[PDB]
Amino acid sequence: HISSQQHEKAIKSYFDEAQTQGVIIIKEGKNLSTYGNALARANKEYVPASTFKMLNALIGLENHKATTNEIFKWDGKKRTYPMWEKDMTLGEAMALSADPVYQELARRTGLELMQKEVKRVNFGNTNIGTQVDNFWLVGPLKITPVQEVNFADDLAHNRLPFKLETQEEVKKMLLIKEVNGSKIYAKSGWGMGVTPQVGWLTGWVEQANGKKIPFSLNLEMKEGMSGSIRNEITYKSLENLGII
């Protein structure tokens, strides 16, 4: 019964109230819907930042560079955040967004194989440059919010060109919340290198009845915003639209 004018106004106001500029793309079946207070962001390119971890994991598992139970040991060096100073599986490193683990995985993959696989998957602009362990942070790899939600839709439905078991293993790593019989799978991103800074939350809702609704939030992060604004805006949006 709620007008779409009213949905548009409410979701816009969640971005307005967080004092950011951002878009959330929702995909239902084949239809893409764009909401937020900066709709033109939807087809602009930004660094994927930590969202690239989902593909990094698929590539590393498909090519036998790691298994899902393997423990990546902390090497004992000081790490940007204390929560990263511990031993982790890929799945724990996914949830904490632990760059050192995923950097180790990228080095095991190596520049050549990473380039061939990022091309084969057609992710974003497909260009990873010549440094295998930082191309997702400050260029040259870029991707639009439309491309991110289409990647999430592909993973949610097992349509990427990787084994089914590989896709299932990576999807178990991405479960971040249950809400009234609904499961949210998503990976967050915060590109602190680039100016302006970019924030992501990309994933899908799996509803009770089995339907999967992909989404990609993309916003500008400003000095001294909480990371959890990505979660709050996403949850409020999906709830406003009755998706969760």
Residue numbers in the entry: 32 to 275
The authors write:
For the V130D complex, imipenem appears to sample two conformations, which are modeled at occupancies of 0.7:0.3. Electron density for the three distal atoms of the C2 side chain was not observed, and these atoms are not present in the final model. The main difference between each of these complexes is the placement of the C2 side chain, which regardless of conformation, makes few interactions within the active site. A single Δ1R tautomer is observed in the K84D complex, but in the V130D complex, the pyrroline ring appears to sample both the Δ1R and Δ1S tautomers.
To better understand the structure–function relationship between the carbapenem-hydrolyzing class D β-lactamase OXA-24/40 found in Acinetobacter baumannii and carbapenem substrates, we analyzed steady-state kinetics with the carbapenem antibiotics meropenem and ertapenem and determined the structures of complexes of OXA-24/40 bound to imipenem, meropenem, doripenem, and ertapenem, as well as the expanded-spectrum cephalosporin cefotaxime, using X-ray crystallography. Two deacylation-deficient variants of OXA-24/40 (K84D and V130D) were employed to capture acyl–enzyme complexes with the substrates.
